[PDB]
Amino acid sequence: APRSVDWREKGYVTPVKNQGQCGSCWAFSATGALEGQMFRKTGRLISLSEQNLVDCSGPQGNEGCNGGLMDYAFQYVQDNGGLDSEESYPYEATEESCKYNPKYSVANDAGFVDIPKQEKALMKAVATVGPISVAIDAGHESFLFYKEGIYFEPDCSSEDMDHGVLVVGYGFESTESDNNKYWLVKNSWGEEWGMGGYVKMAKDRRNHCGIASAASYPTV
């Protein structure tokens, strides 16, 4: 595999969004991964509707602003036969009744692929597929105040993840500790968080914060 990958450079990645005060991170991770696999297929990058997932993918196991899973969103899109665009079904950060309209669908998928629980396999997936949906333990003050550099939190758990985000690549930079590898992660807390809304999460450090534990992508 390459030592460095950044799918934003290949046009796979929409700008950073902001979920507000709704527990819908899973919808943003999912749209992020489907935006990538749709681009891969069609060569067109279209922002997808998290509200569509929030309002409508309850039958697949999701619970709106109370939480969800990217794989359940991927299943909804297959079951539903479509997903509306962000422009047509904009984000309101509250759960409402489903207003999906197939005429405004701009995306589809035929299931999803779960990546084996290993950073080595996650790396191979990111290198060959595109942006990957992943779950992390973001429940630490250090994560809130992140500004730059490689994020490493010694109290981070590799099993109890609470936040869906999107790995758009990986790389390295020299550090004091010589723990130099990172996953490049798109968040959904707006541009003012982190590095323009991105975080470099420690890579090949014993599955730091569980980044490889629940990784998947939609099959388009």
Q: Report residue 79 as tokens.
A: 């079951």
Coil vs helix vs strand at 111: coil
Q: What is the DSSP letter of 189?
A: B
Q: Please report where in the chains the tokens 């060959």 appear, as a residue.
A: 128
Residues in 153-192 that interact with Na ion by CB under 5 A:
190, 192
Is 55 marked within a binding site? Answer: no
Closest Cα partner for 207 from 124, 118, 123? 118
Sign of the CA dihedral running 163, 13, 20, 79: negative
Q: Closer to Na ion at the Cβ: 90 or 196?
A: 196
Contact characters 188-217, Na ion, x per CB under 5 A: --x-xx------------------------
**Whole-angstrom Cα distance, residue 70 to residue 74?**
6
Tell me the site size for Na ion, rule CB under 5 A: 3
Report which secondary-structure segment, H or E, holds 127: helix 119-128
The residues annotated as belonging to the active site are 25, 163, 187
Least distance between Na ion and beta carbon 38 (Å): 25
Minimum gap (Å) between residue 17 Cβ and Na ion: 10
Nearer to Na ion, 141 or 192 (CB): 192
The verdict on whether residue 114 carries a ligand-binding annotation is: yes
Binding site feature residues for Zn(2+): 9, 50, 71, 86, 92, 96, 114, 137, 140, 160, 162
Using CB under 5 A, list all residues that contact Na ion.
190, 192-193
